[PDB]
Design a protein around this motif. Structure first.
Motif, PDB file in Angstrom:
ATOM      1  N   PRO A  72       0.832  -1.211   0.000  1.00  0.00           N
ATOM      2  CA  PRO A  72       0.000   0.000   0.000  1.00  0.00           C
ATOM      3  C   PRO A  72       0.862   1.255   0.000  1.00  0.00           C
ATOM      4  CG  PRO A  72      -0.053  -1.085   2.141  1.00  0.00           C
ATOM      5  CD  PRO A  72       0.618  -2.035   1.201  1.00  0.00           C
ATOM      6  N   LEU A  73       0.552   2.166  -0.919  1.00  0.00           N
ATOM      7  CA  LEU A  73       1.360   3.366  -1.102  1.00  0.00           C
ATOM      8  C   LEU A  73       1.210   4.296   0.096  1.00  0.00           C
ATOM      9  CD1 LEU A  73       0.941   4.270  -4.887  1.00  0.00           C
ATOM     10  CD2 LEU A  73       2.827   3.098  -3.730  1.00  0.00           C
ATOM     11  N   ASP A  74       2.331   4.630   0.729  1.00  0.00           N
ATOM     12  CA  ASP A  74       2.346   5.615   1.808  1.00  0.00           C
ATOM     13  C   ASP A  74       2.111   6.991   1.199  1.00  0.00           C
ATOM     14  OD1 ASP A  74       2.863   7.243   4.052  1.00  0.00           O
ATOM     15  OD2 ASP A  74       4.292   5.783   4.850  1.00  0.00           O
ATOM     16  N   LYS A  75       0.879   7.489   1.319  1.00  0.00           N
ATOM     17  CA  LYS A  75       0.533   8.781   0.737  1.00  0.00           C
ATOM     18  C   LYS A  75       1.270   9.936   1.399  1.00  0.00           C
ATOM     19  CE  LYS A  75      -1.995   6.980  -2.259  1.00  0.00           C
ATOM     20  NZ  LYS A  75      -3.401   6.600  -1.946  1.00  0.00           N
ATOM     21  N   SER A  76       1.773   9.747   2.621  1.00  0.00           N
ATOM     22  CA  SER A  76       2.503  10.817   3.290  1.00  0.00           C
ATOM     23  C   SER A  76       3.856  11.071   2.639  1.00  0.00           C
ATOM     24  CB  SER A  76       2.676  10.489   4.773  1.00  0.00           C
ATOM     25  OG  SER A  76       3.707   9.538   4.972  1.00  0.00           O
ATOM     26  N   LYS A  77       4.421  10.067   1.973  1.00  0.00           N
ATOM     27  CA  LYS A  77       5.691  10.206   1.275  1.00  0.00           C
ATOM     28  C   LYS A  77       5.525  10.720  -0.150  1.00  0.00           C
ATOM     29  CE  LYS A  77       6.683   8.153   5.044  1.00  0.00           C
ATOM     30  NZ  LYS A  77       6.579   9.078   6.204  1.00  0.00           N
ATOM     31  N   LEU A  78       4.312  11.113  -0.539  1.00  0.00           N
ATOM     32  CA  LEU A  78       4.024  11.606  -1.886  1.00  0.00           C
ATOM     33  C   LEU A  78       3.257  12.917  -1.769  1.00  0.00           C
ATOM     34  CD1 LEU A  78       2.897   8.185  -3.391  1.00  0.00           C
ATOM     35  CD2 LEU A  78       5.102   9.302  -3.786  1.00  0.00           C
ATOM     36  N   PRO A  79       3.947  14.017  -1.452  1.00  0.00           N
ATOM     37  CA  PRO A  79       3.239  15.299  -1.299  1.00  0.00           C
ATOM     38  C   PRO A  79       2.605  15.801  -2.583  1.00  0.00           C
ATOM     39  CG  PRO A  79       5.425  15.362  -0.281  1.00  0.00           C
ATOM     40  CD  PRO A  79       5.378  14.134  -1.131  1.00  0.00           C
ATOM     41  N   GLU A  80       3.220  15.543  -3.736  1.00  0.00           N
ATOM     42  CA  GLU A  80       2.701  16.016  -5.013  1.00  0.00           C
ATOM     43  C   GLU A  80       1.562  15.156  -5.550  1.00  0.00           C
ATOM     44  OE1 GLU A  80       3.720  19.054  -6.674  1.00  0.00           O
ATOM     45  OE2 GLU A  80       5.693  18.560  -7.503  1.00  0.00           O
ATOM     46  N   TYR A 265       9.752   5.619  -3.559  1.00  0.00           N
ATOM     47  CA  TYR A 265       8.921   6.781  -3.262  1.00  0.00           C
ATOM     48  C   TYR A 265       9.517   8.048  -3.862  1.00  0.00           C
ATOM     49  CZ  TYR A 265       5.777   4.295  -0.114  1.00  0.00           C
ATOM     50  OH  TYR A 265       4.827   3.449   0.409  1.00  0.00           O
ATOM     51  N   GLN A 266      10.847   8.165  -3.846  1.00  0.00           N
ATOM     52  CA  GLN A 266      11.490   9.297  -4.507  1.00  0.00           C
ATOM     53  C   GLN A 266      11.167   9.321  -5.996  1.00  0.00           C
ATOM     54  OE1 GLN A 266      15.617   9.094  -1.988  1.00  0.00           O
ATOM     55  NE2 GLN A 266      15.443  10.738  -3.507  1.00  0.00           N
ATOM     56  N   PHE A 267      11.233   8.161  -6.655  1.00  0.00           N
ATOM     57  CA  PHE A 267      10.930   8.106  -8.083  1.00  0.00           C
ATOM     58  C   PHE A 267       9.462   8.414  -8.355  1.00  0.00           C
ATOM     59  CE2 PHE A 267      10.229   6.093 -12.224  1.00  0.00           C
ATOM     60  CZ  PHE A 267      11.300   6.600 -12.932  1.00  0.00           C
ATOM     61  N   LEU A 268       8.563   7.947  -7.487  1.00  0.00           N
ATOM     62  CA  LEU A 268       7.146   8.248  -7.670  1.00  0.00           C
ATOM     63  C   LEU A 268       6.878   9.741  -7.521  1.00  0.00           C
ATOM     64  CD1 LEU A 268       5.513   5.231  -5.789  1.00  0.00           C
ATOM     65  CD2 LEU A 268       5.646   5.611  -8.262  1.00  0.00           C
ATOM     66  N   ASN A 269       7.506  10.379  -6.528  1.00  0.00           N
ATOM     67  CA  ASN A 269       7.377  11.825  -6.383  1.00  0.00           C
ATOM     68  C   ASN A 269       7.955  12.551  -7.591  1.00  0.00           C
ATOM     69  OD1 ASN A 269       6.191  13.478  -4.213  1.00  0.00           O
ATOM     70  ND2 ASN A 269       7.238  12.036  -2.846  1.00  0.00           N
ATOM     71  N   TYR A 270       9.059  12.037  -8.138  1.00  0.00           N
ATOM     72  CA  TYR A 270       9.624  12.606  -9.358  1.00  0.00           C
ATOM     73  C   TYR A 270       8.636  12.514 -10.514  1.00  0.00           C
ATOM     74  CZ  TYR A 270      12.989  13.410 -13.144  1.00  0.00           C
ATOM     75  OH  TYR A 270      13.648  13.896 -14.248  1.00  0.00           O
TER      76      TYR A 270
END
Ligand SMILES: [Cl-]
Ligand SMILES: [Cl-]
Length: 341
Positions: A72-80, A265-270
């Motif tokens: 499950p994707l941690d939405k807190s690590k994806l601000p964008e 998570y860094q790549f997903l935010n990117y």
């Protein structure tokens, strides 16, 4: 020491996305590709793939919601995450409730591919190429029969399209909707359809042997580009009709046993950055699920109504819900009855 292992379709990313991410973050990305969804799905269901991020279909992810395959994707690590289109998010939530496992990457539709010149020759400049009327009204299919009409060999998608065209629930749970009016209209249209196939229509559109077809957007764009490359003078276009169409999504997902979750998570935010995914869409000619990225997409892709449809069409898009087995049997037998014509 920073490692990230990605598994994606071939040529499904901009040529410099991974390089820019590596130069900015200092992470070493191992980017592997596959040419068939069977490989990815078999590896994912076998387990211990060694991948941190994979790009499966939303329907496969829906089929694998309780198997513990994805994290499950941690939405807190994806601000964008706020950049994603809430409408498309609601659409994919039907495959992934509360957008828990999947981040929508690109999407396409099941629309109408057609020969512009032949259609406008047999139906005039007023040909309703922006409506399913072009292919779902018997009066127009009678005039189009001579130049070639083809349907997908996909009973679920075709039946959902017909149910939406008839004003019913595109994923109705009533068997009478399938055996009754949908079957009635399909059998009324059958004498004008040359064949039911989900791949031959690509080359048949490219060569001009078929003039109108129910098709997936990528296949129709491939046929049109093949015609352009051949310089044969065949003008193939794709249309998402105004009554709506079935949409399908590719998603980024994180396997449960991913070892580099921070880098993933860094790549997903990117990817959630508007310029990043807009550049990707500029390369791959697919609409992305990032609303904030839409004005940054090239005018060649952004202004193509067959890729980025207007809001009134987007409000009528729908996804394919998984049906209960009785509906599946009714659908299959009705499709067999329809194809016997
Ligand atoms: Cl794909
Ligand atoms: Cl599909």
């Amino acid at each position: 020491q920073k490692t990230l292992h990605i598994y994606n379709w071939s040529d499904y990313i901009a040529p410099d996305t991974v390089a820019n991410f590596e130069k900015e973050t200092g992470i070493k990305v191992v980017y592997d590709v596959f040419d068939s969804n069977e490989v990815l799905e078999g590896k994912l269901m076998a387990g211990s793939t060694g991948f941190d991020l994979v790009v499966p279909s939303a329907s496969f992810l829906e089929r694998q919601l309780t198997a513990g395959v994805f994290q499950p994707l941690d939405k807190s690590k994806l601000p964008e995450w706020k950049n994603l289109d809430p409408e498309l998010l609601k659409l994919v939530a039907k495959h992934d409730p509360d957008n828990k496992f999947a981040m929508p990457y690109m999407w396409a539709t099941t629309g109408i591919g057609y020969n512009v010149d032949k259609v406008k020759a047999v139906l005039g400049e007023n040909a309703p190429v922006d409506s399913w009327d072009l292919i779902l009204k018997p009066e127009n299919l009678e005039k189009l029969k001579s130049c070639g009409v083809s349907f997908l060999d996909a009973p679920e998608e075709v039946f959902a399209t017909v149910l939406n065209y008839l004003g019913k629930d595109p994923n109705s749970t009533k068997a009478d909707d399938y055996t009754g009016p949908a079957t009635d209209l399909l059998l009324k249209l059958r004498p004008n359809i040359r064949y039911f196939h989900s791949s031959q229509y690509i080359n048949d559109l490219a060569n001009g042997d078929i003039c109108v077809a129910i098709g997936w957007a990528g296949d129709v764009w491939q046929a049109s580009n093949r015609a352009k490359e051949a310089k044969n003078g065949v003008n193939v276009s794709f249309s998402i009709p105004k009554e709506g169409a079935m949409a399908f999504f590719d998603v980024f997902a994180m396997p449960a046993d991913a070892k580099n979750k921070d880098e993933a998570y860094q790549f997903l935010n990117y990817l959630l950055r508007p310029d990043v995914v807009a550049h990707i869409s500029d390369h791959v000619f697919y609409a992305n699920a990032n609303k904030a990225a839409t004005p940054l997409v090239s005018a060649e892709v952004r202004e193509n109504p067959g890729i980025y449809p207007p809001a009134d069409v987007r409000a009528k898009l729908f996804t394919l819900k998984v049906q209960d087995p009785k509906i599946d049997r009714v659908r299959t037998r009705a499709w067999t009855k329809v194809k016997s014509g």
